[PDB]
Amino acid sequence: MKRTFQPSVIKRKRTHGFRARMATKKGRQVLARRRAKGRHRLTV
Amino acid sequence: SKLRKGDTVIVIAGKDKGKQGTVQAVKNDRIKVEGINIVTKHQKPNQATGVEGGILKQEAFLHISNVAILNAQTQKADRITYQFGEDGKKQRVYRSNGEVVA
Amino acid sequence: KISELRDKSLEELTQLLDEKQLDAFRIRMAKATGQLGNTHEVRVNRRAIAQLQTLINEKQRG
Amino acid sequence: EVDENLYLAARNIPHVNVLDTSEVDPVSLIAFDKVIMSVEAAKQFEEAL
Amino acid sequence: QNSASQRSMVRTYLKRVDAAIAAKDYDAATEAYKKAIPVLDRMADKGIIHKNKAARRKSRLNKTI
Amino acid sequence: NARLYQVLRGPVFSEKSQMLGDSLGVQVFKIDSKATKLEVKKAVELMFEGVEVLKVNTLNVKGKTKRFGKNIGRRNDYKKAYVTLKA
Amino acid sequence: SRVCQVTGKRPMVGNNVSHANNKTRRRFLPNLHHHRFWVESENRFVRLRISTKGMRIIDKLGIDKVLVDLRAQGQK
RNA sequence: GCUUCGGGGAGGCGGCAAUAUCCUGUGAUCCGGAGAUUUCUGAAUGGGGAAACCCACUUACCAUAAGGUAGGUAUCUUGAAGAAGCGAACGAGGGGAAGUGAAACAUCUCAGUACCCUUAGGAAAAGACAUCAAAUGAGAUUCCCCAAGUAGCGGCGAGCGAACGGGGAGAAGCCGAUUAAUGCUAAUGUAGAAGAACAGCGUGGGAAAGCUGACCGUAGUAGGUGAUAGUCCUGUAUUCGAAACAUUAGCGUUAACAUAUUAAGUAGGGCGGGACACGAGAAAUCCUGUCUGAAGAUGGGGGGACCAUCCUCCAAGGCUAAAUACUCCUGACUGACCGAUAGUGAACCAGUACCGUGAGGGAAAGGCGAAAAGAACCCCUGUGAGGGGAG
């Protein structure tokens, strides 16, 4: 059973990175929503 | 806050009311007076600690309001007021007699 | 002590600061080995280094 | 009219209160057990009512 | 009730100031107005009377004086 | 000159350190994380007179995770170096 | 973008209205054309993306007037 | 955590959470103003990147070694100065749904709402008549109560829904009613100080409650203190302080910008749309994608198709405070609001544990006693747990 999740830090960092979020304008809005909510972990 | 270490006080409340002892220390709102409000203490001997341990008799902190300063001349509890001199030095003054002491 | 630090002129403050750095290194070594009897000396020494650095900075500025 | 001295004297007292004739409330009149009132104030109550 | 009495006390002083204005005497108006000022400032803190209203009354009285 | 004093945080005491010192006469010092081998060599030579360092080895160790009470904490990471000395 | 420089015309929004009076959102685009205007004061052709009303404004007011208006407006 | 300037006068080195070394009348801890230091990531801005990392170039100085100290090196706009990014609601503008209702549904409604995008200020917008009115005419804009669910619009269904005018708030008209500093005058704020008066007796673990008799009151329904205190403490009424910095107003002065001179591709018109309570309707009025296009004061716009008369006003230049909208916040005060399944999800180490790749979802959990005085010591037990004595 190759299960749904299979971790790879390189792909995880590229897909959910802080820099990737900053690159797109919309992702900055997601980061701002995390900050407004007060979540400690903004990004993986 | 008016009361300070090193001056005699009289306790007018509690089991030890009517007993006069010197104030060992004050923290913020609690005061400790030698020979007043003694409480039994149980100490567990520890070889690391220097103290021998065992049953000890020691002072217990009590609320500041209960204790009152004792005026020497009249030997009665008296309230404390502050009087400002021309020189500007500040000293505690007994309310009853305007006594300069304490 | 702050007046004593203030009175002296900059060039000798620099040398005094270097001496203080050496003393702090020795104090750290003695603390690490446990030779140092009393732990207040290290704190007071750190405060002294901070005071010296501030005085040097003010004198250099003006 | 209400003078400052009479107000300062009255306010501290537990159940003594002072009010001007114009600014009078039924809850106060009913509540407080006794009422002290001047003839001139009474005349102005007549004119008001 | 207490607040009502606090309000009541001021009105008499203001009426006296109005009578002083009618007299047109400088010192009589000045003493009454200076007597009133602090009480109005104090009542302003309680919130019974608007601070803007108190400032407007002070400006009007100063202009009248 | 000021930096050289800060380079070395102190000695390291352990059974391995004692064995190394006895067998090979090599000392073991805690150092600043950012301090490099060349700085460690210069600081050792400055602090101790009459000692010349053949080689310097540096390694980084992650701090262990220790649980106290209701909270989760990790020890501060520290860096240590092995310094060889002339016989 | 699809904007007339001289007059600032840009796409308008409106409704396509069917005979049954159904409404659908639609756009009205300006009649924009590339045109090389001859300018004697600089002895050169300047290419503008201009509307038909813009070309009429060139005709009525002069390429020099319109060009100085654009330079005041910004992009040149 | 450092320096300085003020306050304060006996304790203190933040909390769980104590211990040790110590500091402190040579004024410590603590509070208020100012200054210095302020690693790395992040608009991140020397290049790059998987955020807290890699690699650099260069100016000056120092060292002789394989370096250190202080700087400079992003992009765009304007001609050296600006901008970038973040963050509540309100404002303005560019786009703009559907569930739903009509007992179906397409016109219509929902609704110009949700949402997306852009961009300000303490408000914004609008604002001075090419506006209404037709009354004896009024005289900018904005908001509130009526007019009035009226007149109207409407598969004339469901529904949508004014205006004239009256009463109020506030008032103002101009062509510099702009911005940003600096300097004086006045005030405020940012630490604080003083601040009245109770004793006896009995009950009680403890008195503040009971009995008796006193005192202050510009302070008597405040919070605590071993049970319910005006007179025990902190407080309240009352009177009040500022070395330093901020803010507000008045004045003076500077340097940035602006400073029209009466308005043409403009009014009007054809086609297609949109907004007007108004859904093309007899449809006035406004905006424009397209094509057109005047008069220009002997003229032109409006007065709800349109014509005539009459009345009113001068579009195609710009600006303008108040009354109005809001609360991420600061100070004071309040509540016939809740009291740990309630009240914010979060009274407690909560946007945490936990769940998910991610966007994101999202808990549970308070209380010994007045004071730890938190059970010395003995016994059973495995030096455990737990308990019986003692206290």
- Backbone φ, ψ for residue B88 (5° rounding): 105, -10
Q: What are phi and psi of F63, to 5 degrees?
A: -75, 145
List Cβ neighbours of F32 (8 Å cut-off, separation of 6 or more): F6, F7, F9, F79
Q: How far apart are CA B90 and CA A44, in angstroms?
A: 63
Distance CA E49, CA E7 (A): 9
B13: the nucleotide nearest its CA (via C1') is: H206
Q: Minimal CA–CA distance to F10: which of B60, D45, C50, C30? A: C30
- What secondary structure letter does DSSP report for D41? H
Nearest by Cα to E1 from C33, D15, F64: D15
E2 contacts D4? CB cut-off 8 A: no
> Angle CA(F61)–CA(F63)–CA(F68) in degrees, nearest 5?
165
Q: Is the CB of G52 under 7 A from strand H?
A: yes
To which residue do tokens 């001047």 refer? D38
A11 touches strand H (CB under 7 A): no
Query: What is the SS3 assignment for F9?
Result: strand
Q: For residues F39 and F9, what is the distance between their CA atoms, to the nearest angstrom?
A: 13
Resolution of the structure, angstroms: 3.2
Task: Return contacts of E55-62, CB within 8 angstroms, 24+ apart.
Answer: E61/E17, E61/E33
Q: How far apart are the first and last CA of chain C?
A: 22
Could you say which residues from 8 to 37 on chain E have a Cβ atom under 8 Å away from some Cβ of chain D?
A: 8-9, 11-13, 15, 35
Both structure tokens of F47: 């602090």
CB–CB of D11 and E5 under 8 A?
yes
Rounded to 5°, the CA angle G14-G19-G24 comes to 30
Q: Do chains E and D touch (3 or more CB pairs under 8 A)?
A: yes
Q: Is the distance from CB of C24 to CB of C52 less than 8 angstroms?
A: no
- CB contact burial E19-41 (16+ within 10 A = b; e otherwise): ebbeeeeeeebeebbeebeeebe
State the Cα–Cα distance between residues B42 and F82, nearest whole angstrom. 52
Residues 14-33 of D with CB under 7 A from strand H: 14
The answer to whether the CB atoms of D11 and E2 lie below 8 A apart is yes
Paired tokens of B84: 């400002």
Taking the C-alpha atoms of residue G50 and residue G58, their distance in angstroms, rounded to an integer, is 10
CA distance A22 to A29: 9
Cβ–Cβ below 8 Å for C21 and F8: no
| Residue E5 burial (CB count, 10 A) | 20
* Partner-chain contact F11 C18, CB within 8 Å: no
Nearest protein residue, CA measured to C1' of H1: C47
The alpha-carbon gap from F70 to the nearest alpha carbon of chain C, in Å, equals 30
Question: What are residue B41's phi and psi, to 5 degrees?
Answer: -130, 135
Q: Which amino acid makes up residue C50?
A: A
Our CA angle for F9, F14, F18, nearest 5°, is 100
SS3 track for B10-77: EECCCCCCCEEEEEEEECCCEEEECCCCEEEECCCCCCCCCCCCCCEEEECCEECCCEEEEECCCCEE
Strand partners, F10: F30
List subunits contacting chain F, requiring 3 or more Cβ pairs under 8 Å: C
DSSP, residue by residue, E7-38: HHHHHHHHHHHHHHHHHT-HHHHHHHHHHHHH
Torsion of CA F37, F39, F42, F45, to 10 degrees: -70
Structure tokens at G75: 């992009």
Is the minimum distance from the CB of G5 to strand H below 7 Å?
A: no
CA to C1' distance (Å), from G1 to H274:
23
Separation of alpha carbons G72 and D5, rounded Å = 75
Distance (Å, whole) CA G31 – CA G54: 10
3-state per-residue secondary structure call for C2-40 = HHHHHHCCHHHHHHHHHHHHHHHHHHHHHHHHCCCCCCH
Nearest to G51 by CA among G13, G22, G9, G21: G9
Closest CA to F86 of F44, F30, F32, F25: F25
